Amino acid sequence: MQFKVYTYKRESRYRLFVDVQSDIIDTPGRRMVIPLASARLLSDKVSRELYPVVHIGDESWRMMTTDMASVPVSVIGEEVADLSHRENDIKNAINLMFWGI
Amino acid sequence: MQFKVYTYYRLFVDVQSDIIDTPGRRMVIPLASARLLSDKVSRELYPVVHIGDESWRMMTTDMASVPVSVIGEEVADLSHRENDIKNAINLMFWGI
Amino acid sequence: MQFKVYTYKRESRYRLFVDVQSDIIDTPGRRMVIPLASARLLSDKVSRELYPVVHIGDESWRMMTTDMASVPVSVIGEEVADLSHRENDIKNAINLMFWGI
Amino acid sequence: MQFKVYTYYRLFVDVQSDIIDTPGRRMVIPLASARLLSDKVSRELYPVVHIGDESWRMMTTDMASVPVSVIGEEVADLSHRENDIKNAINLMFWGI
Amino acid sequence: MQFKVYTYYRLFVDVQSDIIDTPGRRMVIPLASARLLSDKVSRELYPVVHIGDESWRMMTTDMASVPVSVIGEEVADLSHRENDIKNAINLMFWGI
Amino acid sequence: MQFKVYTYKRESRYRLFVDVQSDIIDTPGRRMVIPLASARLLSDKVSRELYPVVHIGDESWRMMTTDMASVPVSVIGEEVADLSHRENDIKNAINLMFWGI
Amino acid sequence: MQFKVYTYKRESRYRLFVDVQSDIIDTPGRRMVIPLASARLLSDKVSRELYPVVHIGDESWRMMTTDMASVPVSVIGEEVADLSHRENDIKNAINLMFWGI
Amino acid sequence: MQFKVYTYYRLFVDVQSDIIDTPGRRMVIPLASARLLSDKVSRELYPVVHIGDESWRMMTTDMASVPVSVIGEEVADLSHRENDIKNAINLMFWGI
Ligand SMILES: [Cl-]
Ligand SMILES: [Cl-]
Ligand SMILES: [Cl-]
Ligand SMILES: [Cl-]
Ligand SMILES: [Cl-]
């Protein structure tokens, strides 16, 4: 579901990621997701517009927008958080990456 | 064993006949959380099953041959859903 | 398309595979396929009911029914042959693997 | 570069903005032989494009981030289809 | 962050500058248990560091670019070993 | 060998890369390499200090310094070119990535 | 270290493996190892001396000699046991696989 | 077939006994271009062999079990080097 954060049930690649695909579009075998990385791993210089900073619990995470990928629904784990309140920032990040707007 | 769900916490249903014994691989259909697919997705092709209190969708179109050495513990039995599973598989291959 | 044999555009132990999914069922991102292997690689003691032998050119190939897999359409190459005339054998192989008898 | 088709799982359309340099990767949409999908499959979500005399479907839902080091030679330019490509992507993310 | 040790219980040291944001990856050097290598192996090229009560060897020649999304929790800080790490890296590239 | 550009035997990840490891340091099973990418894939706004632009034949390539990796010698293909004349730029790129302040 | 049994840090595979490389030979990035599998009666044609049975705790394990592989030292876990007392059997298994006339 | 060289340009030498064949796997030692290793690298452990003009190093320490289904065409025969290959393998396991 869009704006929900899930865990990955596989080996490497990611730990956490945000589902950014519309809830009316069923692939249905996959979902478009944006992986999250520990905010401490990126400096303050890195654009918060392309790579928004979100809070899951008490920790800060960066949305690695440019590492967006299609992931099979069978590997999507448990729902960890909801980032619906950040809809505007997420939308801007995605629109910026594709349309430079 | 046919219609049993196993782990390797990823889930999959064994859909191969119990008579096909020699092959070192079992045909399985992966399960996905039902909340991940809308109700508009065909229940004929992607049946919805229950394991515990949760709902899962059978990702019929992601069927795959998996080595028996990676098949984990038996989590549930879906024998009572034999008819739905059979229809899903027959629809994907011959389906009308 | 069902019963058509195609080349694989990925790194695989197999160079040819047969599309066995219905033409009325669009996933649409994947197709159910059965890989082909050189017949010389399997002894005659291996069931011809479950592993049909087909011909493409001057070579004999075995259908590795038990290695059936869902493959993305983007990796399906050029059409090499048509096995429509073997529909009955292919159907029996698939029905045997799932429903036995 | 945006709307350009490149080779390597053989054909991909670069759909990332030219103003956004990752710079190690690019967002791409894989192409599949149009003959592999029936006409009943939405052209809004999966546009049909022509490279040479052959027809290809844009597998929008299989979009992925790909390292620039694996992007091959430029095969074609789909700038004239900008509107269709834009609609496909916007539909997948914001569709109502 | 440079000179910090992270989890993958696999361990590796971030050796990339903090002023250089890829930003999707980080250059890291994997750590291996010191008991696995004899004392005859160069400590100049493969420095020995301590994390807790265990000794680890820096597998400098196995250095690799790793995506930030797979970097786990910070386990230790090896800033005090900056000189040894710097020498190991400079030796591998420039023959010191 | 240092400053030499080679091809990659496997079909994945790389196509061409530059060996940047010292010739006096034998791993000996691996070599530190920097992958090359078509220069047209990156805009001119991308730092030439960190990502040098080199020429191999008539084509321009960018050195993807931040994607540096250890690669087994068994997968290193044929020698395509020599970039010894660019030693200073390559050295600066590497030193900047590790020791930049 | 030779004849020591370790736990793995990577995915898939077995669970335990025996280091069979000489202690005087430092690669130093890899170690030759033989994976262990839960003891079971084999059907593998000739030789049961090709797959020695060893004990770790109260359990029995078979040395899958033919699945020997080079493994990076960074993925070798904690030392679980020592099979130095079985040196002769291990040596014979390895010599049989390579030179077994 | 022991002492021979097969592919999948890639190159590897089959070093398993011809007596042992039941597993669908063969022990192989990968070959690397001799130019990739300096002359200071032991020829006892990493023998140098020739195949159609070029020189190759046997990467003894990268020995691995490979499935027979992925072994390609026979490119050469190194039976005449049996003694060197045997010594390399014995050295790696028994220290000379
Ligand atoms: Cl139910
Ligand atoms: Cl896939
Ligand atoms: Cl067109
Ligand atoms: Cl220390
Ligand atoms: Cl130049």
Curated annotation (Swiss-Prot), chains A, C, F, G:
> Impact of altering W99 to L/Q/S/Y?
Loss of toxicity
Changes seen on gene knockout: Disruption of both ccdA and ccdB has no phenotype, except for increased plasmid loss.
What's in the keyword line of the UniProt record? Plasmid, Repressor, Toxin-antitoxin system, Transcription, Transcription regulation
Heme in keyword set: no
GO biological-process terms attached to the record: negative regulation of DNA-templated DNA replication; negative regulation of DNA-templated transcription; plasmid maintenance
Q: Which GO terms describe its cellular component?
A: toxin-antitoxin complex; transcription repressor complex
What Gene Ontology molecular function terms does this protein carry?
Answer: DNA topoisomerase type II (double strand cut, ATP-hydrolyzing) inhibitor activity
Q: Which InterPro entries match?
A: CcdB, Plasmid_toxin/cell-grow_inhib
Question: What SUPFAM superfamilies does its record include?
Answer: Cell growth inhibitor/plasmid maintenance toxic component
Instruction: State a single Pfam family of this protein.
Output: CcdB
The task this protein performs is described as: Toxic component of a type II toxin-antitoxin (TA) system, functioning in plasmid maintainence. Responsible for the post-segregational killing (PSK) of plasmid-free cells, also referred to as a plasmid addiction system. Half-life of over 2 hours. Cell killing by CcdB is accompanied by filamentation, defects in chromosome and plasmid segregation, defects in cell division, formation of anucleate cells, decreased DNA synthesis and plasmid loss.
Family the UniProt entry places it in: Belongs to the CcdB toxin family.
Q: How does it assemble?
A: Homodimer. Forms a complex with GyrA, probably a tetramer GyrA(2)CcdB(2), in which GyrA is inactive. Forms a complex with antitoxin CcdA; there are both high- and low-affinity binding sites for CcdA such that both CcdA-CcdB(2) and CcdA(2)CcdB(2) complexes can form. The CcdA-CcdB(2) trimer is sufficient for rejuvenation, whereas maximal operon repression occurs with CcdA(2)CcdB(2). When the CcdA:CcdB ratio is lower than 1, a CcdA(2)-CcdB(4) complex is formed which is devoid of repression activity. In this case repression is alleviated and both proteins are produced.
User: What is the name attached to this protein's record?
Assistant: Toxin CcdB
UniProt lists the gene as ccdB
